[PDB]
Design a protein around this nucleic acid. Structure first.
Ligand SMILES: [Mg+2]
Ligand SMILES: [Zn+2]
Lengths: 120, 55, 145, 81, 189, 139, 101, 72, 143
RNA sequence: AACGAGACUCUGGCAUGCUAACUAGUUACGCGACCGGUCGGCGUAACUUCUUAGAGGGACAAGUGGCGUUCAGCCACCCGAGAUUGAGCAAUAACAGGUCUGUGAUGCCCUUAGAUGUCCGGGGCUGCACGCGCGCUACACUGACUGGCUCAGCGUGUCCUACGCCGGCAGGCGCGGGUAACCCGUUGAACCCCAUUCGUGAUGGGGAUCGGGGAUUGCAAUUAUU
C-alpha cells in the first residue's frame, strides 16, 4: 500500500502532524481543530483491543456510535462496529480507507427494490 | 454519572435553543428586533406592543 | 485650457496610460499576471497581455477622481455578474491582491501618496503625470481631427 | 423604589368594553342563563347612552352542537379607520 | 432646424393615401431628434395615434423576451438600419418607412366565427390605426424571423425587409402575411 | 446675475447653477458630449438647438446630477438647463424674451418645463411584481 | 457653559411636537440661545407575517408597521436651567434623553 | 445543408473580394460573407484590409455592426 | 489578411484528432484534460500567438506546446492549475490528459468498489453520489 | 333615514411661498493641487433651490365646448404638479372550510416509571423503475466573452465592516468607526452605454454529472452544508 509515497510503517511511526498533512483539507479541518474526549476514548479502547488480540486472530469487536470519527492509520486491521442506527454493523479496516470516515462503510438504509405502482 | 449527561450539549445556537417568550414554542420565531416570539402570539398582542396596521 | 483629465473620453485615456506605463519601463509586474483571472466572476483569462498596465491606468484614474478608495473599495469597484449553474445570477467583487498591489506598485513608483483620512490620493508628481497623459492624448485627438 | 402603583376607578364602566365583557364572562360563570344576563348587560350599556352595541356569545349552549347567539342594539360601525 | 439622427430631413417626405395621412406621424411638427421621448401615449384612447412613427417602429423591436426591457438596443438598431437604407435605394429613409407601412398593412381581414375548435372566418375591413399597428408588427416580426440565424445584423435584415416591404416584393415576411389575410378575405366575403 | 434650478425625472435629480459668463455648460465635471449614452447625445442639446446659441452665449451653467438611472439623468440635465433658461430670463431679463423661450420650448416637448409625476409602484405579496401574480392550477 | 443637547424619541408625532414646542418656547423665554427643531429621517419597523395560523390560506400577508420619530434640539446655557425646564415639563408617550457638550 | 466557409482566403475568392466588392453599393461583412462563402473573422478582417487600402468608405461603426459603402 | 499554403486540415496530438481550421486555444481544448483556461495558460507559456489558426503552426510550436503540457511543473504552470493535485498512491502533482483521465476514472472507481464504501455503492447502482434528492428527478436514461 | 360601497388611515406625485437644521447640503471666500477652470480636498461666514419633515395649501368634472327627458352623468379640449396613486380596514349572514401541531387557550379519550415523559448517542424526514405540481436556467448574432465608461432604493448592524500588510482565488492577519441622515457609505449593484475576440457546428451557446485539491462554519460535514 502507498499513501502520498508513504507506506503503513512510516504512517504509524510518523508524528500526528505528518499524518495530518497527507489527508485532504477536509480531514485537516477537523484534525487541526483537535479531536474530542468521546473520540480519544474510542481510540484508547481500540488500542487495548488490538493489544490484547491473539497471535493470528483479529482484536475483539469494539462497537461504536461514532460515524463522524475519522479513521486514523492506527485502526488498520481493527474490527470496528459502526452504528447504522438500527443495528451494529461489521467493519474491517483495510489500509486503503485510512482517509475515509468510519461511517460511510455502514450503509444508511436498505436499498430500494421497486415493485408495481398503486392507486392514488 | 447522570449529572454530566442531562444537559450534555452546546445548544448555544439552533432552533431548539430559542423559544417564544409567551407560549414556549420554537416553531416560526421572529428574530428581528429581539422580539423573540412565534408569529402567532406576536399577531395577538400587536396593539399593546404598539404595532398598528397601517398597511 | 490645459485639458485636465475629465474633458477627454476616458477609454482613450485608459488606452494612453496603459502604454505610457510600458514605455516608462518602471513598474513591478507579478509573476502570476499571465496566470490568473481578474476576478472569481470571470471565466477566461484576459486576451490583452497589457491587462496589468491598463488596469493600473483605470485604477490610477479612479483614484484620480476619488481619494480614500482602498483595498475594500478597489475590490468593490469591479462589478462582476456571476451566473451560477442552474441558479440565478448575482453580483461579485474584484481581486484584493491585484488591485491592492497595483496600488502598492503605484506607491513604489511614487505616484500614489498615503492620505491622513486612511485612503490613498495621488501625489503632486502623479497628478502632473496624469494631466500630462491627458494633455498629450487630448492634443493628439483634437489635432489629428 | 422606582415603581409606584396608583389605582384609579374607570369613571363610566358601562362604556368600557373590557370591563363589561369581563362582567359578562364572570356572570356567565355564575351559572346564569345565556339570554337573561346578556340582555341585562346589553340593556345596561345601551342605557348608559352609548350609540350602539352588540353582544355575541359562541360556544356550547345547548348540547354538543356549536351555537352562536347575537344580540344587536342601535347604530354600529365596522369598516373604515 | 429639426434633423433626424442629425443627418436626415423629415419635412420633405410624402403620404399618398388619405386613411394613413391622419395617423402616421413625423411630417409637420412631431419630427424629433431621437426616437426615445419616454412619453405616455397609452394614457388615453388614440393618444398613441400622435406619437412619432420612427418611435413606433422603435417600440416594437424589443418584442421578444431577452430584448424586452432594453429599449436602447433598438435606437441603436434603428440608427444603422436607416443609414443602410439610404445607401441602397438612395431616397429619404423616412420615405421607405412610409411606403412599408402603407403596403404592409392589411386591408381586409378575417374575424373568427363559430364554436371553439371550428374556425369559420368572415371578412371585414381594417381600421386605419389597426392598419398602421398590424403593419409595423409585421415589419418587426419579419425582421426577427428573417434575422434569427442567418448571421445577419438586424440593421441589415430590417433594411432588407423594409425596402422589400416598400417595393411590393414577396421577399418581405410582411407582404406575405398581408397577402394571406387578403386572400382569406377573398375566400369568405 | 445668479439663478438656480433643479430637474426631476423618477428618482433622478439635477441641479443647474446659472451665472453670467462665456457660455460654458458642464455636467458634474464634463461637457455635453462626454455623457454615457452617445446615442442619447441629441436629446441633451434639444432646447439648445431650439433656443438658438445666442441666448446661451451669455449663460454659464454648472450642473450637478445624482440619483436614478443613466437614461433618467439625461432627462434630468435636459430639464435642468431648460428650466434654467426659463427661470433666469424672468429675473435678469424681461418677460417678453422669457415668453419667446417658453413658446419655443413648449410646442416641441411639454416635458421641458414640467416633470412626470409618475414613479414606481409597490410590488405586493401574491405576485412577482406590481400587478403580476403567481400561477394557479386545478385538477 | 455651552452646547447642551436634548434628544427626543417618541412613538407618535402629535405628543412629540407639542413637547418640542414646550421646550423651545420655554427655553426661548429665559433667553437661552436655541438651535431649534432638527427632525431625523423617520425610522420604520416593518414586519410581514402569515395571517392564518395553519397556512390553509390564500397565502395572505399581514403587514404590521411601527413608526419611531427622533428629533434633536440644541441649547446654549447653564446646566441648571435645562435640567429644571426638562424636569418641570414632562409629557406621556415621549421618552427623553440628555447629552451635554 | 451543412455550411463550409473559407477560414483563410483562396486566390479564386481573393479575385472576388478584390475586383468586385468596390462596385457593390451597400457593403456589409455579412453580405460579403454570404456571397463569397467566406467565414466571419476572415471577412471581417478582409474589410479591415479594404479599409487600409482606401477602397471603401466607412460610414459608422458600433460594436459588432459595421457599415461600409463603395468608393464614389 | 493572409493565404497560408501549408495548412494542416487534420491534426494529431496525444492520441486525439484535432481540428485546426478552428482557433488555436479552442482547438487545443478539444482533447481531454484541457479547457479554454488551461489552454490560454499553455499557449501563453509556449509564446505561441493566439491570432493564428491552429493549422498555421510549425512542427516546432506543436512539439513545444506538447512538451509544455506533458511536463506541467517545470514550465511554471501553477500547482493549482493541475487536474489531479495529489494522487492517492504516489503523492505527486500531475496534469492528466485523455487516456490518463479515463484510466484514473476507471481506477478510482475500482478502489472504491473493492473498499466497500458508500461513494462506490452509489457509483455502482447508477445513482447520483452527491446526496441529491432522487425522488423527483434522476430519471432519464432509465427504463 | 342606518350599516355595507364611498368617506377614512397608510404610501407615491405638487410647493424656487412658510418653519428650520454641524448628524444633510448649498452659495460665497479663503488655503491646497494640476494644467481661467477641474477636484468628495481641508476649513469657515450664507441660506434652504437641492437633502430631510412638519404646518397648511392644491382638484372640486373645475373651466370652455359637444352627447344627454339638457337630469344624472358621459366625451373632447384648455388652465394645471395631478382630470385613472397603490394598499389597509370590510355589513346582515352562513360553511358541520383550515387550526388538539402557535397558545400556562381547552371539553373528552389514552398514556402514566421496562412512560406516548424527558434528556443522552447515533441513524431517519434527503432515500428511487414512476406519475402530478409551483420555480429556477437555457436553447445564442437584440448573443457569449474580454477590457474600458458611469447609475439605484428599501432596509439591515455589538454585528455591519474603513485602511493596510500577507494571500493566484476562497481566505488570513491585523489595527479602526458605529446603538447609527454620525461609522459600513457620495452606499462607484446588474443590465445598458463604448471598444475587443468569436463566426451558424453541440460552436466559446448550455452547463448537468463527476475526479482530484485549497479554504471557511461549526462539538460534529462521510449521505458531496457551503
Ligand atoms: Mg372602505
Ligand atoms: Zn408563542
Amino acid at each position: 500500500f502507498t499513501y502520498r509515497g508513504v507506506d503503513l510503517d512510516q504512517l504509524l511511526d510518523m508524528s500526528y502532524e505528518q499524518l495530518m498533512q497527507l489527508y485532504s483539507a477536509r480531514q485537516r479541518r477537523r484534525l487541526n481543530r483537535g479531536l474530542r474526549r468521546k473520540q480519544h476514548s474510542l481510540l484508547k479502547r481500540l488500542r487495548k483491543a488490538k493489544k490484547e488480540a491473539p497471535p493470528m486472530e483479529k482484536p475483539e469487536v469494539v462497537k461504536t456510535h461514532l460515524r463522524d470519527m475519522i479513521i486514523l492509520p492506527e485502526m488498520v486491521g481493527s474490527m470496528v462496529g459502526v452504528y447504522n442506527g438500527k443495528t451494529f454493523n461489521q467493519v474491517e479496516i483495510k489500509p486503503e480507507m485510512i482517509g475515509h470516515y468510519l461511517g460511510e462503510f455502514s450503509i444508511t438504509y436498505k436499498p430500494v427494490k421497486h415493485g408495481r405502482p398503486g392507486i392514488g | 454519572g447522570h449529572q454530566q449527561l442531562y444537559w450534555s450539549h452546546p445548544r448555544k445556537f439552533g432552533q431548539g435553543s430559542r423559544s417564544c417568550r409567551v407560549c414556549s414554542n420554537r416553531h416560526g420565531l421572529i428574530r428581528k428586533y429581539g422580539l423573540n416570539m412565534c408569529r402567532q402570539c406576536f399577531r395577538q398582542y400587536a396593539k399593546d406592543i404598539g404595532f398598528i396596521k397601517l398597511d | 485650457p490645459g485639458v485636465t483629465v475629465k474633458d477627454v473620453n476616458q477609454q482613450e485615456f485608459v488606452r494612453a496610460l496603459a502604454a505610457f506605463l510600458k514605455k516608462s519601463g518602471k513598474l513591478k509586474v507579478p509573476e502570476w499576471v499571465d496566470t490568473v483571472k481578474l476576478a472569481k466572476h470571470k471565466e477566461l483569462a484576459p486576451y490583452d497581455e497589457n491587462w496589468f498596465y491598463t488596469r493600473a491606468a483605470s485604477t490610477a484614474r479612479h483614484l484620480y477622481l476619488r481619494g480614500g478608495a482602498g483595498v475594500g473599495s478597489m475590490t468593490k469597484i469591479y462589478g462582476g455578474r456571476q451566473r451560477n449553474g442552474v441558479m440565478p445570477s448575482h453580483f461579485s467583487r474584484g481581486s484584493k491582491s491585484v488591485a491592492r498591489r497595483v496600488l502598492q506598485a503605484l506607491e513604489g513608483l511614487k505616484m500614489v501618496e498615503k492620505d491622513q483620512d486612511g485612503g490613498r490620493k495621488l501625489t503632486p508628481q502623479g497628478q502632473r503625470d496624469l494631466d500630462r497623459i491627458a494633455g498629450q492624448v487630448a492634443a493628439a485627438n483634437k489635432k489629428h481631427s | 423604589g422606582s415603581v409606584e402603583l396608583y389605582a384609579e376607578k374607570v369613571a363610566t364602566r358601562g362604556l368600557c368594553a373590557i370591563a363589561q365583557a369581563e362582567s359578562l364572562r364572570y356572570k356567565l360563570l355564575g351559572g346564569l342563563a345565556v339570554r337573561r344576563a346578556c340582555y341585562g348587560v346589553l340593556r345596561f350599556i345601551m342605557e348608559s347612552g352609548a350609540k350602539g352595541c352588540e353582544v355575541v356569545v359562541s360556544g356550547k349552549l345547548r348540547g354538543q352542537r356549536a351555537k352562536s347567539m347575537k344580540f344587536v342594539d342601535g347604530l354600529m360601525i365596522h369598516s373604515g379607520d | 432646424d429639426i434633423k433626424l439622427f442629425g443627418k436626415w430631413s423629415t419635412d420633405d417626405v410624402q403620404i399618398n393615401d388619405i386613411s394613413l395621412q391622419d395617423y402616421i406621424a413625423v411630417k409637420e411638427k412631431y419630427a424629433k431628434y431621437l426616437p426615445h421621448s419616454a412619453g405616455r401615449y397609452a394614457a388615453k384612447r388614440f393618444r398613441k395615434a400622435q406619437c412619432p412613427i420612427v418611435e413606433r417602429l422603435t417600440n416594437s423591436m424589443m418584442m421578444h423576451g431577452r430584448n424586452n426591457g432594453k429599449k436602447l438596443m433598438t435606437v441603436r438598431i434603428v440608427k444603422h438600419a436607416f443609414e443602410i437604407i439610404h445607401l441602397l435605394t438612395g431616397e429619404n429613409p423616412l420615405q421607405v418607412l412610409v411606403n412599408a407601412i402603407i403596403n404592409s398593412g392589411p386591408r381586409e381581414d378575417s374575424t373568427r366565427i363559430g364554436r371553439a375548435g371550428t374556425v369559420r372566418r368572415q371578412a371585414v375591413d381594417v381600421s386605419p390605426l389597426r392598419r398602421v399597428n398590424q403593419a409595423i408588427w409585421l415589419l418587426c416580426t419579419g425582421a426577427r424571423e428573417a434575422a434569427f440565424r442567418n448571421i445577419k445584423t438586424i440593421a441589415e435584415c430590417l433594411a432588407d425587409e423594409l425596402i422589400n416591404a416598400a417595393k411590393g416584393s414577396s421577399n418581405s415576411y410582411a407582404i406575405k402575411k398581408k397577402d394571406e389575410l387578403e386572400r382569406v378575405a377573398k375566400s369568405n366575403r | 446675475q445668479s439663478v438656480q434650478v433643479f430637474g426631476r425625472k423618477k428618482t433622478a435629480t439635477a441641479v443647474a447653477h446659472c451665472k453670467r459668463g462665456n457660455g460654458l455648460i458642464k455636467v458634474n465635471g464634463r461637457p455635453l458630449e462626454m455623457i454615457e449614452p452617445r446615442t442619447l447625445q441629441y436629446k441633451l442639446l434639444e432646447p439648445v438647438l431650439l433656443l438658438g446659441k445666442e441666448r446661451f452665449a451669455g449663460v454659464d451653467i454648472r450642473v450637478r446630477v445624482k440619483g436614478g438611472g443613466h437614461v433618467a439623468q439625461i432627462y434630468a440635465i435636459r430639464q435642468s438647463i431648460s428650466k434654467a433658461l426659463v427661470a433666469y430670463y424672468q429675473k435678469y431679463v424681461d418677460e417678453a424674451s422669457k415668453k419667446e423661450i417658453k413658446d419655443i420650448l413648449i410646442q416641441y416637448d411639454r416635458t421641458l418645463l414640467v416633470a412626470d409625476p409618475r414613479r414606481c409602484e409597490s410590488k405586493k405579496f401574491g405576485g412577482p411584481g406590481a400587478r403580476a401574480r403567481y400561477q394557479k392550477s386545478y385538477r | 457653559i455651552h452646547r447642551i443637547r436634548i434628544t427626543l424619541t417618541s412613538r407618535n408625532v402629535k405628543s412629540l411636537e407639542k413637547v418640542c414646542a414646550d421646550l423651545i418656547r420655554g427655553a426661548k423665554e429665559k433667553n437661552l440661545k436655541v438651535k431649534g427643531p432638527v427632525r431625523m429621517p423617520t425610522k420604520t419597523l416593518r414586519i410581514t407575517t402569515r395571517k392564518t395560523p395553519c397556512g390553509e390560506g390564500s397565502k395572505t400577508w399581514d403587514r404590521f408597521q411601527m413608526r419611531i420619530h427622533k428629533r434633536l434640539i440644541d441649547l446654549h446655557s447653564p446646566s441648571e436651567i435645562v435640567k429644571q425646564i426638562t424636569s418641570i415639563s414632562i409629557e406621556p408617550g415621549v421618552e427623553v434623553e440628555v447629552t451635554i457638550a | 445543408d451543412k455550411l463550409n466557409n473559407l477560414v483563410l482566403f483562396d486566390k479564386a475568392t481573393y479575385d472576388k473580394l478584390c475586383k468586385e466588392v468596390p462596385n457593390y453599393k451597400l457593403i456589409t461583412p455579412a453580405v460579403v460573407s454570404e456571397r463569397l462563402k467566406i467565414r466571419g473573422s476572415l471577412a471581417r478582417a478582409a474589410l479591415q484590409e479594404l479599409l487600409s487600402k482606401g477602397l471603401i468608405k466607412l460610414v459608422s461603426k458600433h460594436r459588432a455592426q459595421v457599415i461600409y459603402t463603395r468608393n464614389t | 489578411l493572409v493565404i497560408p499554403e501549408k495548412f494542416q486540415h487534420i491534426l494529431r496530438v496525444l492520441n486525439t484528432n484535432i481540428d485546426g481550421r478552428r482557433k488555436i486555444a479552442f482547438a487545443i481544448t478539444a482533447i481531454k484534460g484541457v479547457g479554454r483556461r488551461y489552454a490560454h495558460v499553455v499557449l501563453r507559456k509556449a509564446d505561441i500567438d493566439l491570432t493564428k489558426r491552429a493549422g498555421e503552426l510549425t512542427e516546432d510550436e506543436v512539439e513545444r506546446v506538447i512538451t509544455i503540457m506533458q511536463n506541467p511543473r517545470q514550465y511554471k504552470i501553477p500547482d493549482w492549475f493541475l487536474n489531479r493535485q495529489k494522487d492517492v498512491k504516489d503523492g505527486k502533482y500531475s496534469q492528466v490528459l485523455a487516456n490518463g483521465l479515463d484510466n484514473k476514472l476507471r481506477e478510482d472507481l475500482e478502489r472504491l468498489k473493492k473498499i466497500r464504501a458508500h461513494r462506490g455503492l452509489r457509483h455502482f447502482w447508477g445513482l447520483r453520489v452527491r446526496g441529491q434528492h432522487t425522488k423527483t428527478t434522476g430519471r432519464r436514461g432509465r427504463t
